[model samples]
Target: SWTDDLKVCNQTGVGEAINQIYKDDGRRCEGYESRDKKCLCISDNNTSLYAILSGHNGVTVAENALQEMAAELLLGQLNVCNTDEAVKELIRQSFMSVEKGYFDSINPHVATKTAIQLHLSVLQKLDSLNNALSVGSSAVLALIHRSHLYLGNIGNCRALLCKTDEHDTLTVTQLSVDHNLLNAEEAARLFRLGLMAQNFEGVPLYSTRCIGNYLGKAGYKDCNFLSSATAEPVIFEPEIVGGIQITPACRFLVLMSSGLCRALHEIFPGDASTGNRELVRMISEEFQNQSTLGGVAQSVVHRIVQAHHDTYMQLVEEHRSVTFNSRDDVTLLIRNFNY
Candidate 1:
């Protein structure tokens, strides 16, 4: 709704930031919507951050994570962190900080400290019938510093780097790992932790690692599937990768919630790599056709939605082979490097 870009700093009159497109896709996917949150912040130093958070169960977890992100991830000496381990640790700590902060907010004492009479009693009632708990979000964050990119993620939200070769054929390298049973590393980790892989079969979310969702951690006992686990089955431990050298081959970056991936997959109807390739290709075509990076981002999203809707109509009208349904909410952030 506003004129923007590297505009993040232009508006603030401080720390430079990349020109980007941060927006909800054009499709009106109305269903029981899971929340998706995003943020961008600058340190006025060389470091810039952009991230997306996909909420499940309820919106509070994603909401809280967004509020805490700048303080925990972008501020202080984060810009000075150059070493790989130190940067990784900083990113991990940011996730854990949100995990701790959210749990602390829900702590019982806050009610009394705020002088709410009979609040604990009300809490007890709400505890029995609550809007809290079983709430969580998957997040993926990207940091641009010097000639590298640092990625930190929990759950299935993705951070991808798009590149091209002499042929101009686009290739996507996923910077973040999906933490779910379907991931071999994740499943292996659970096995090593002495948890049964099959136990997570019916877990509410496919993401085994995320911020919040206290019950997924402390209340593992409540689920028969997870009852026997010796440790917290679901954790907030982040998977961090980077200090990846940004070379001339790199084109742009795509950061998105799982919902966008799912939406693209529905249209591509093939392996994940195919969907990712299609997404990058769509953006690639836009880069050539559009003037502004923001325009490119917006055009690609609209094209995806229009293509998806056209496909849906084909399936329904031609074969009547589709369900009457809607897609999940999607949030996309596109960062143009040299495109």
Candidate 2:
């Protein structure tokens, strides 16, 4: 139950992140907990659960961009969503709504990106709903359809589900696209706006889409950019890209924000581990200690399915509910089911 607000940033620095584990007995919940509603028990079933969350300032927000993003992410993932298909469907519907509202407005790209980002995060809350309504199944299925969902936003927040084969080789099964600054079309949009800023590599300074915007405000505050009436709405484009992969004896699942993904690449490039809880904790501790990058509090969940001749009995825990400890806001979700 992670609950800290923007005001807390003045006291605790950049953003807030916390993790917790809960033992469910179909009666009540127990373990280390925060006061956030997402982390609280709503049932009497004894099911094990764990969750991690954070918040920071918005992009345009001068003080707590991380906190704001965390908030948006959590706000997006409040309900019982257990399966990826359900999550994707909800996201698709929300994006469709935003697309429906699109017209030849001011900045079509920005408007479309903003709408998609808002829906992407909000759609996270459907997790609980997914669980309640979910029919359990596994085994990758065909892509009946894919809708182009978003255009224009920043941040590399993405999730992926992977499976392994008999040869112990890893394969990526599914992934969400990132809203990166390197998007060629987005750069062209900025050039059209006459506000393009290029780095040594000539890449733009911001991302193509973001959960909460953090640019251009009174004296350059992110808040001003989000609320400024002067900004014109852009045309909407919601296209969903589809692809597939296959892996048996699934290894692990990944949940990441842009901050960690963008920076960790420099440490070992593609050598990052997708191990169990211990690995997640190792990364968290390392992030806090390393000064090479700004800490955005990283965490990932993996199913401990590998058979190992070990002494200690491992605990099998499932996600029940979630709480957050961010300065801005945060949200994430994923699942693979056979239908």
Candidate 3:
């Protein structure tokens, strides 16, 4: 749970910085990504790490799901685990920690319910998995199913929903609601009551609410007094403070983080899922329609850190600054399924 909270702050702040560059001269080449029936472009840029899930992050994930998807992305997935047992331990350790916290907050029956449900959800997906690697492998299947269309993610990574009509209308139907404290009713209440803590002026960071830190990994496993409990017990049920969007099949979907989601969602009312023209427009507007920046994937990254000085200054003056309370990690999880 603590790790999940850490991821939200980690990812959102990074994304905000990227967006700032684009808001300036629109030449930073920062933008988000998309996922199609075939090519699902997933990107992640936290405070320090920058990667494409399908491209780079996925490599980390494939290497790790050698082990797991700690968050929507796996920032530190490769930072620890040198062996298969270690990887499994990383995953189990986070689960154990979250479960422990959940039991402390509730009762034995509630804890049992949480465990069963989580086990079932994970097992159901695992059961459907044609390739289950206990020892972790590098088979193509591992990379193929790593996307949201094939499998969901955790941590700061994201999932999006898009629908395209026969009329070539690509409408941005739904944005992935994080399974974090952002939209958690109870968490919000706790924050208001001073019972819980929130870094972004009241937003709790515990991931039990959504994608969290991986206790089985390094950055999160530092149990030092200064870094002890970097992660909390992994809560199986992320409903209480959950804020994730699971969509119906239509045309397209984007699985991105706050970097892309926060900026674009703030600017436009909806995304390309609304229509192909709009989708293209979203891409075109980001790069001033430059042929070099025409690629959808590149634009996503371009928007990150492309804010104009005047615009950014104006925003901050008007109480729209992209600081931690405003700026965070940026990731893109775009998708177009009905193509």
What C-alpha lDDT do the candidate models reach, one value each? 0.68, 0.29, 0.33
Predictions: Cα RMSD each: 7.0, 18.1, 16.2
lDDT of 3 by residue, 222-249 (tens): 2222133334323233211121222444
What would the per-residue lDDT of candidate 2 be over residues 55-74, giving only the tens digit for each residue?
A: 11212121122232233223
lDDT of 1 by residue, 175-225 (tens): 888787546788887887688756754342367889887767876665566
Best by TM-score: 1
Q: Model 3: runs farther than 4 Å from truth? A: 1-151, 166-168, 184-199, 202-250, 262-281, 284-294, 307-311, 316-329, 333-339
Task: Please report, as a residue range, the 10-residue window in candidate 2 with the lowest summed lDDT.
Answer: 133-142
Ranking by lDDT: 1, 3, 2
Off by over 4 Å in 2: 1-56, 59-89, 95-154, 182-205, 212-249, 266-339
How many Å off is the CA of 291 in candidate 3? 7.8
Ranking of models by TM-score: 1, 3, 2
TM-score, one value per model = 0.75, 0.35, 0.40
Q: After best superposition, candidate 3 residue 39: deviation in angstroms?
A: 11
